[PDB]
Design a protein around this nucleic acid. Structure first.
Lengths: 260, 188, 271, 185
RNA sequence: UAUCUGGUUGAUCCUGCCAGUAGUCAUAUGCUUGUCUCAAAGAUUAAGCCAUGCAUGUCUAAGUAUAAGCAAAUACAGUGAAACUGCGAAUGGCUCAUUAAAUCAGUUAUCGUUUAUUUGAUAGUUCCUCUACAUGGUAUAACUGUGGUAAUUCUAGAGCUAAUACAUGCUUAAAAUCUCGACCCUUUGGAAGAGAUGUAUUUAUUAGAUAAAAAAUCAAUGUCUUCGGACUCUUUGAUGAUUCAUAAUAACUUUUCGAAUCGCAUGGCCUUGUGCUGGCGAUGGUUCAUUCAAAUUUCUGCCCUAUCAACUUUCGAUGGUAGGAUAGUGGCCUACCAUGGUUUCAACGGGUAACGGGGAAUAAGGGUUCGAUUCCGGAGAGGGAGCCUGAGAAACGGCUACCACAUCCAAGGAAGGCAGCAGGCGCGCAAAUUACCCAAUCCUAAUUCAGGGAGGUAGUGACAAUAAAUAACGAUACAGGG
RNA sequence: GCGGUAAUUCCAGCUCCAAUAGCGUAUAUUAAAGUUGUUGCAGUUAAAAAGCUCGUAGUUGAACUUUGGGCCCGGUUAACGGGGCCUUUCCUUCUGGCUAAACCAGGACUUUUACUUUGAAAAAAUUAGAGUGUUCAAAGCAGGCGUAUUGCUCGAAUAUAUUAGCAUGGAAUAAUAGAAUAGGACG
RNA sequence: ACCCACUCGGCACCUUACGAGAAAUCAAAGUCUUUGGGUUCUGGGGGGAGUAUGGUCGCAAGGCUGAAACUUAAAGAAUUG
């Protein structure tokens, strides 16, 4: 329609934003950035609909222009900055650091992280190439292009950027037996180990994943993010440890922590 | 103006389509440039995305390449002798990509004298060692020597004049040269 | 489909062209006496305030300022709606002057007060008399609603009470406007400028002239000629027909000059 | 451009409108329980038919399907929390076996009749309407309140409403004023 | 959740249609009208015509300040009208006329392309075998003053002055490798000094290996042994797939880029020079990637019609070769050459009171009917066409031309586009205020500040939907069940 | 005054019934309708079997090819379903170890299909539905609890989407191909 | 050639109701509300009307295909008088 779109109505937003269908007829529409808009969380939604620190648009605006919210160690002053997966956004005025990660239900949940281990961020290296003037580089899921990688790092792997200038630390190879987290699809939010990977030339190699409670599932390779080996993942997992229990035992847990 | 969409032609079944919309812009076409022979006259054209296509309207002294020795010299262009697609461009001397043209000889023969030392159509002991090292490789086929004796070579333009301005090409060798001589002598 | 569309268009053009030669007959805009007379109905009411509210919403301060000093009949040209309004305020101490001003006018506007009730001896008789003597198009409007308590609920209670009063007196119109709100002032202005007046049968079948320049020239020591520059409306006048001037009587016309022809009364004069 | 607000009508007219038997039954119910018109009976019959359809199409489901177990437990739990089903009738054929009457009995108007305090069903309706009864603490004036079990024992007179003290009402106030001005001096 | 009943009925039975019954988030109309929550509303006829007003502007410490502007550091310095500059004006909002393999739906592809911005990376090579870089030059607006016109956001000649305006313009290391070679000293020959070596464009060529092991040959023949001649690691990434990414060589270019910008801070060094060096940013900039997108695209799916059976190719219909053009593939266009392509599994033609879908009403299931309309995708701004600017338009709250309406007059000329919000006329069975506000939701900008008829609030409002006041308790006297 | 009055009641009142802040009417559509019939109509006489036969596309089409038995183990409440072994029976495209062409550890594995199970990828709203006292309800996605002095905290599920495309288990049912000139397999 | 018994394939008949049907009646009009062996054709209350129009076949006569507006509550089987 004669140019790019700038508006986003309600009932066109992502469902995991948890926007009320009343109280206005428009949604933030995050501007361009590290992530696509369907898999992103703008700072306005994160600061007025999750933390309740703000109350409206102008209060989170006065938050941002006061230079208190930093995304990946950099001060960002856009209300619709698309903060997405494995961002390490911090509020230095109150001394908490936050990491964005999907909850067991599939929505972006608050997850408090310490002063240490907020100094890094994982990233699925998405495609590796050899740039102009012969230099080799990688680019990950959040648009970061890092020059001079380790030669063992191939397509669809995990690197560990710290904060400052790329400078890739110890990485993780992609093979069966590694702890893997899901960034898309019906099984969005489960954790588990690869028990097998199926290969289909032409399109969409699938992965068989078994979780900690012997509940296996299958997912496309685009939704696979390996976070470490067995027993010791390098990040702090969210609540519930990504299991996706069914409704009956969830109601049993409601009746278990009911009372007092 | 000029349209490139596939909505004003009939479908695969002979079905006549109807006008779905007006002529959009992102499918436009532009007027041809029948680039002639003369002094350099080039007009620039702004394109979709904000790029530029240097439309050459008149051009001479283009770049040409010898593949076997792999050299490239800026040389004048005497004119078109054969065009594979249309015949009227031969008569009006219009340049295109992949065109059989006649060019002048002299920069190539001065390079050959300075590089190999032998002569076509008929001191400095370091340069003597250079020629001795470059000896036993000075043999080229007969027709290029006959053209050098004539003073004009048959080359093929392999660059797009109306799309980048330059009129670059390569001089013919071997089976290509034989086929183009056969076609030129059979038709003309 | 295209034949259907052409049949629809041709029938529609037929219908519209049948409906055109009923309304097109009038002309205004550049010159028209569309006379508006302002009739107060409460003694504690200033019609100059009404005209101030009317002329304030055309963004023309200079015309009102020039109207402040000494004038009662006003020729105001509106460039917003491009209309030549002529505003007349009758003398409230001469009730017959009010009757004459309303019976010559095309539009009359009724000023109503929200604080003081309409007198049964002063305004109600005026309403009845103007209804009975022959009335053209009328608009009723409120001006002193700001003198009522500030909260809008009481003011709209007053407004609907006077709307009920007016619809007992004139049921054809139903909404009485507020000049405190600029919006209803603009509605009054567009109604006065654009809407065509209806006709009163007795006055439009014998013609009427509203005058601006009536001076005297000497012809004989016993009688002479008065000079009436005026706007003719209705049927027009003839040089031989008699003319009546209120509080003056009936007289014979002598000469007519048309400025926008010369007519002299011949031997067919009515005696 | 604002999202549409959803709504739904909560009653249904009978297909055969005019026959003696159920008209007799409805007028009997209105007489016994104090009903304004036939909308109340249609509303209870509509929600009862919805409940019975739910119980039925979970009953056609095969045994030990987790959906059948979960939704059946939820339906039985809500219908015992309201207080219509008895405690020892937590079965699907038993929730198929409901009537209009035991749904209408759990209303607040019938309950403020049954706990004393009203001495007549129409007195109960006009005195529940009139803002006199607090459930728990909150004053409610809806005859179709559908009293639960855990709030059954808290139906009391309001902190307002002179039946529970606190500054007697308007007619008594004006009668006291009249006897003060007349019989006082 | 699954009921029927009358009409042919004269006495009977079935076929059969009609009438009665119920529902409608389905439109209107008639009568009446107390309360609470909630809110659709000029779609059908006319995508018909429009008076008036608003609907798009924007400045931070961070482009330009001599306002004879308001206020209070001898270059300026607070705030700041106007104007140049930059960005937006291509989002929104409205409508459903066109559209019947077209849009659309789900599913793919771009190894066939464009992409302002956001985010991440990214520029020691520039004039040069006689030079401002402690900083090149022109104009012009705003402004002063003079005027023309009836009018318009009309403008002319005259004089001033700036840029992140327009136009030019050097810095910068060292090493290495090649072409030309003063040559000299006499050979298996080896050498002073001259040039070139960023990026971008275009062309030609080369590298981009890799299924496991054994000798004899010559030519280009390099290092080293012990000059017999021996010879070893030798370097190559991704993809299912590439003439891929990339590198190298020879050149080519009306040589594209490689900071003559701005704010806030006064740090360190000593040869103590108004020297050297140095921070935090904003704004730009080439190329690639990411992101917002865009454009073409594969598979399968549409309403009624045989009173539509053959259709497409003069004037491209189907394919091949080459060219033009495009951002790019492609009959998208041209030249040449073939004679093809679709069809009873219904092509082609016609109708649609047809935008498509998510959906809605009807509850035994299956189905029948509807979808102009709160979301998604398409098309259009009275009908066509063309186009400027720009990353993005065939834009219409931009232009040009014709066409149909139609406005102002000084009769010479000028201005127009409500299917945006209010509202008016008309057409009708059929549909609201020429109200208040940016406080909420969000958008645009130089950006917390300004703007937004986007949107919210209220008024009209029995579209539809929820809850339930118009009476309740005694005593008396009778009638009762007693 | 009575009775009759193609008065199709000619006009009004009393009483009663239904629904009720709503009720009726017109039109369109849906259900009851099995008067569109795939589920699910009918064709002697009620509408309706071509005058008759051949015949192309269309639809439909006889039977037959691994059965049966034994072994163990473990899963769910004596029953139910599962997997491997043997019984002439694991049949194919390739690496690394034990070896003397054949065992073990490993990627895939439909002659071409139809069918069917499971799964992925499937916008929100709407639909069904779990929780929660908007005073109830239609709704909304809130909320709930505390030293109510700098607090704690659950949750915003789930299900469906029959087509076309993608992956996967099965081989009954329904198709196709294989060696009759052996121009065939296996070393 | 005739007689007895059997069998295949026919044209027909008498009785019955295991069943069917509205009834007359039916060895099919049965295996049908407990509704599915395969497949062609035709009908949707009566008039208008096998009319009008179009196409096609035919020398002609005519044949094949074939609506609508409008209007109406109606239009097979037995017994009984």
């Amino acid at each position: 329609a004669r140019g790019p779109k700038k508006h986003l109505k309600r009932l066109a937003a992502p469902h995991h934003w948890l926007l009320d269908k009343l109280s206005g007829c428009y949604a933030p529409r995050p501007s361009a950035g590290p992530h696509k808009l369907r898999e992103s969380l703008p700072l306005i939604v994160f600061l007025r609909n999750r933390l309740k620190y703000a109350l409206n648009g102008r209060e989170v605006k006065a938050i941002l222009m006061q230079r208190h919210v930093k995304v990946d160690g950099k001060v960002r002053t856009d209300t619709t900055y698309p903060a997405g997966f494995m961002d390490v956004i911090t509020l230095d005025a109150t001394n908490e650091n936050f990491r964005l990660v999907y909850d067991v239900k599939g929505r972006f949940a608050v997850h408090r992280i310490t002063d240490e281990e907020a100094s890094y961020k994982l990233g699925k290296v998405k495609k590796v190439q050899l740039g102009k003037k012969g230099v080799p580089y990688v680019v990950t899921h959040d648009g970061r292009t890092i020059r001079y990688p380790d030669p063992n790092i191939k397509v669809n792997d995990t690197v560990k950027i710290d904060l400052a200038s790329g400078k890739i630390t110890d990485f993780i190879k992609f093979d069966a037996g590694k702890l893997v987290y899901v960034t898309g699809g019906r099984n969005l939010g489960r954790i588990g180990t690869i028990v097998h990977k199926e290969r289909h030339d032409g399109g969409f190699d699938l992965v068989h994943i078994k979780d900690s409670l012997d509940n296996t599932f299958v997912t496309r390779l685009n939704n696979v993010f390996v976070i470490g080996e067995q027993g010791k993942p390098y990040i702090s997992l969210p609540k519930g440890k990504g299991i996706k229990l069914s409704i009956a035992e969830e109601r049993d847990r409601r009746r278990a922590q009911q009372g007092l | 103006g000029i349209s490139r969409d596939s909505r004003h032609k009939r479908s695969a079944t002979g079905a006549k389509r109807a006008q779905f919309r007006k002529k959009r812009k992102f499918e436009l076409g532009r007027q041809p440039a029948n680039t002639k022979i003369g002094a350099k006259r080039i007009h620039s054209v702004r394109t979709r995305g904000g790029n530029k296509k240097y439309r050459a309207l008149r051009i001479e002294t283009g770049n040409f390449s010898w593949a076997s020795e792999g050299i490239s010299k800026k040389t004048r262009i005497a004119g078109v002798v054969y065009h594979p697609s249309n015949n009227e461009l031969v008569r009006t001397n219009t340049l295109t990509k992949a065109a059989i043209v006649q060019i002048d000889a002299t920069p190539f023969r001065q390079w050959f004298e300075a590089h190999y030392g032998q002569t076509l159509g008929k001191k400095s002991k370091n340069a003597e060692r250079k020629w001795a090292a470059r000896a036993a490789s000075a043999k080229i086929e007969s027709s290029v020597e006959s053209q050098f004796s004539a003073g004009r070579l048959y080359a093929c333009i392999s660059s797009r004049p109306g799309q980048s301005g330059r009129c670059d090409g390569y001089i013919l060798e071997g089976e290509e040269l034989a086929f183009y001589l056969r076609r030129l002598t059979a038709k003309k | 489909k295209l034949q259907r569309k052409n049949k629809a268009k041709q029938l529609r053009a037929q219908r519209i062209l049948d409906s055109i030669e009923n309304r097109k007959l009038f002309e205004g805009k550049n010159g028209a006496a569309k006379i508006i007379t302002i009739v107060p109905l409460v003694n504690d009411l200033d019609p100059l305030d009404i005209l101030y509210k009317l002329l304030k919403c055309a963004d023309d301060e200079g015309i009102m300022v020039q109207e402040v000093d000494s004038k009662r009949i006003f020729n105001v040209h509106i460039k917003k709606f491009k209309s030549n309004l002529k505003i007349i305020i009758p003398d409230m101490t001469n009730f017959l002057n009010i009757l004459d001003c309303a019976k010559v006018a095309d539009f009359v506007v009724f000023g109503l007060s929200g604080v003081q009730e309409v007198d049964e001896e002063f305004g109600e008789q005026i309403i009845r008399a103007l209804e009975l003597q022959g009335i053209a198009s009328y608009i009723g409007v409120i001006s002193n609603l700001s003198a009522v308590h500030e909260k809008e609920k009481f003011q709209l209670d007053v407004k609907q009470s006077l709307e009920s009063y007016f619809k007992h007196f004139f049921p054809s119109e139903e909404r009485v406007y507020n000049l405190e709100k600029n919006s209803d002032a603009l509605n009054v202005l567009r109604t006065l400028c654009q809407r065509l007046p209806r006709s009163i049968n007795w006055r439009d079948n014998r013609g009427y002239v509203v005058a601006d320049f009536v001076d005297f020239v000497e012809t004989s020591p016993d009688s002479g000629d008065l000079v009436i520059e005026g706007t003719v409306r209705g049927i027009g006048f003839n040089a031989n027909r008699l003319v009546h001037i209120p509080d003056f009587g009936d007289f014979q016309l002598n000469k007519i000059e048309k400025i926008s022809t010369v007519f002299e009364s011949n031997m067919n004069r009515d005696t | 451009p604002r999202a549409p607000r959803t709504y739904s009508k909560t009653y249904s007219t009978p297909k055969r409108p005019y026959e003696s038997s159920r008209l007799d039954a409805e007028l009997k119910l209105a007489g016994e329980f104090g009903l304004k018109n036939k909308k109340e009976i249609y509303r209870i019959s509509f929600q009862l038919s919805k409940i019975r359809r739910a119980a039925r199409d979970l009953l056609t489901r095969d045994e030990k399907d987790p959906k059948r177990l979960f939704e059946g437990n939820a339906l039985i739990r809500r219908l015992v929390r309201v207080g219509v089903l008895s405690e020892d009738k937590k079965k699907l054929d038993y929730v198929l076996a409901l009537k209009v009457e035991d749904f209408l009995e759990r209303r607040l108007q019938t309950q403020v009749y049954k706990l004393g305090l009203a001495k007549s069903v129409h007195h109960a309706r006009v005195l529940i309407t009139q803002r006199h009864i607090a459930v728990g603490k909150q004053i409610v004036n809806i005859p179709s309140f559908m009293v639960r079990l855990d709030s059954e024992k808290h139906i009391d007179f309001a902190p307002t409403s002179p039946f529970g003290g606190a500054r007697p009402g308007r007619v008594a106030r004006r009668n006291a004023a009249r006897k003060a001005e007349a019989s006082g001096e």
